[PDB]
Design a protein around this ligand. Structure first.
Ligand SMILES: [Zn+2]
Ligand SMILES: [Zn+2]
Ligand SMILES: [Zn+2]
Ligand SMILES: [Zn+2]
Lengths: 423, 418
């Protein structure tokens, strides 16, 4: 008999914890649905912030916080703490309960070292437990300010939208930090409205990376992109045929591959591990590669083409090279790399994005420059082609930020100028 | 309950013929891409030099009264009944035909009477069908056909697992186009490469003669990504049309995910037919006209074989005129299209990569013979891709493969020391 007690005896809470695992609801805790039919680009609603935490909101407290930070660095930068404290002191009791009951990864978290130190050093009256609660509500529910670099903004209804790597809704800031929410796609009444918790600088990357970016909200993303059978953002050059793409995919810590697009062969697990090592090596190299040294980026790109076929690392190298060539006035190769960028993004992330729209616009710029090196009279055909790209940019920006937005009117301006120069 | 007559039965049910060419073929071994599966000699090579007297006769009866099938088919059929031993004459007569019971055509009885041959009409007729539905065009000779025994046992696929090319003495060299395991089916395209990159409706039209509606992996795919129109709502995404049982539906737009109405679908089908008609009057000898048609076509199409055809016309026109700048753009669009709709190894794709290499090398050389390393490497990549595909299609030592690899190694030789 190896029983230490009767197995039917009631457990203690620690003993229960040994057997089972509670999972708290994925951030940000709620789903939001449209009540009506929406056409692409139409406004769903516009929301004013609960609070805009700016140094300008309380610079007394700001100087104090920055000086506390300079003496002993604090885990979250000062802005998060100005936001939290001003959320506990500046709003009404109701506004307060609106932010305290938003989603948080650790509801019962004890006050951190940082929190108690701020309370004692700045001598404030707010409860440490609520101070902690609020620092995480803004860590996991706010948006970065549009212009001011140490600024953040919280909204109430916006936090109700679940995450998706292929979001149904897009957004942009209005004039007084208004949050303008638009339909990114055609929607029917009752459809879910989702936004990307992850920035556009990572949305074009592969499933493993995006999942790493949203793990903080304590879920493994299973959105339509993230759960797709083929991760077409993670393609390696097949070593058998030398030209097709094999797309890798990681689930439960194990990586598998699609069959090569051309020769239909599957790589062995040993080849998969080999190319995962290559992948990590080039991810590391990307941090040392940039547009101020184009020869170096050319070296890295040449080496990377042997490893990658339609991969976000290769897209990043195309980006570096395009910006380097564009800055140097070399429209010829900038053109090639920009066309590869358009190919990649339209395969991997086809819905309207600022990245794609400005890919089309900047392709228009590059083509127009290259053409104008032959003289101002650019032939009709070329003009039309250039115009098409500008138009595409317009068409996407129209959906993302509206007819009269500065981006949209810029793209449309270039388009109509192109038409103006037509015979 | 009284028995039906045969016409009464035919009113109620529809019989499905064994689809041409009647058989399936499977590999007994694992195959690497590009490996030779086997090489087969022809049962017969029908060319004028096979029987010049018969040929001259044939010609003159054709010029008096035109034959429905050109003379070479009759040369093939007759010579199959006259010149082959009994063993091989039976292998030909055993081959798939659409109409086993078909009475002698009037062309057949005429040729029998005016050439004065002793062959049985009904066999003659049947042999015709055999050669029309089982033979290949000769590599060199116009008015030439070739018929093989084992090759005819491969079923058709628009995404074939096997590829082929002619060797010396009209040998049929069959290679694996993809990696295959023992027991996998060997298929070839009954459709020429001039149609393989087109949409499912068109390919099915091209194989209807073998009496089946193609349901290969491409034709049965939920989305026909060779038939993509420009979404009228968003102005930028693609909506892919699909036709089944005479009715056309559309995928949601790739960008705004709206579905077109049946009205919009019919409108864009009318546009599609109009541009298919215009293609017959559009070609590379009038580049301005093709530019007009392309400019109007971009408003209708997003990723469509008609747009690919216009890209092809413009690429060849600009290439012939030495305009590497515009040819570059259109060739890139061609590569995009083909690699999306027809990604497996093909001569079309391989030579798309090779000619992209040519165009970029020309364009670069307009700046001087010393082409920078980067550009060279990119150019080399294209050449290498061409090589890689032709290696699979026709072997390492084939003239095509050697040509692509030659351009590639030349590119590498021009690279600076550092
Ligand atoms: Zn996801
Ligand atoms: Zn491969
Ligand atoms: Zn098919
Ligand atoms: Zn659309």
């Amino acid at each position: 008999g190896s029983h230490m007690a009767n197995p039917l005896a009631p457990y203690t809470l620690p003993q229960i914890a040994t057997k089972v695992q509670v999972k708290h609801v994925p951030g940000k805790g709620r789903c939001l649905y449209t009540k009506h039919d929406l056409e692409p680009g139409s406004i769903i609603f516009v929301e004013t912030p609960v609070l805009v935490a700016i140094p300008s909101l309380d610079e007394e407290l700001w100087s104090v916080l920055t000086e506390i930070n300079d003496e002993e660095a604090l885990e979250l930068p000062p802005v998060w703490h100005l936001a939290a404290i001003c959320s506990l002191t500046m709003l009404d009791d109701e506004k307060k309960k609106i932010c305290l009951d938003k989603w948080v990864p650790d509801p019962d978290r004890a006050p951190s070292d940082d929190v108690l130190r701020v309370i004692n050093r700045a001598g404030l009256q707010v409860h440490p437990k609520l101070y902690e609660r609020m620092l995480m509500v803004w860590r996991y529910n706010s948006f970065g300010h549009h212009t001011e670099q140490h600024g953040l903004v919280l909204y109430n209804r916006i936090s109700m939208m679940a995450h998706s790597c292929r979001a149904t809704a897009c957004w942009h800031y209005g004039e007084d930090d208004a949050f303008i929410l638009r339909a990114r796609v055609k929607l029917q009444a009752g459809d879910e409205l989702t936004i990307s918790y992850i920035g556009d600088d990572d949305l074009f990357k592969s499933t493993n990376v995006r999942r790493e970016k949203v793990y903080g909200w304590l879920f493994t993303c299973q959105c339509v992109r993230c759960a797709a059978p083929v991760d077409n953002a993670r393609g390696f050059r097949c070593p058998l045929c030398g030209t097709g793409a094999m797309f890798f995919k990681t689930e439960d810590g194990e990586t598998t591959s699609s069959a090569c697009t051309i020769c239909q062969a599957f790589p062995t697990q040993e080849t998969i591990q080999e190319y995962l090592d290559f992948e990590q090596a080039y991810v590391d190299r990307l941090a040392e590669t940039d547009k101020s040294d184009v020869p170096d980026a050319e070296l890295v790109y040449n080496q990377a083409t042997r490893v990658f076929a339609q991969h976000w690392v290769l897209y990043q190298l195309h980006t570096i090279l395009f910006e380097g060539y564009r800055d140097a006035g070399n429209s010829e190769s900038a053109s090639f790399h920009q066309m590869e960028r358009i190919k990649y993004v339209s395969q991997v992330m086809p819905l309207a994005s600022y990245t794609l729209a400005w890919l089309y616009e900047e392709m228009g710029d590059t083509m127009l420059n290259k053409a104008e090196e032959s003289g101002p009279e650019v032939p009709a055909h070329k003009l039309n082609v250039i115009s098409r790209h500008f138009e595409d940019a317009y068409n996407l920006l129209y959906i993302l930020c509206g007819e009269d937005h500065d981006y949209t009117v810029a793209a449309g301006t270039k388009k109509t100028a192109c038409e103006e120069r037509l015979p």
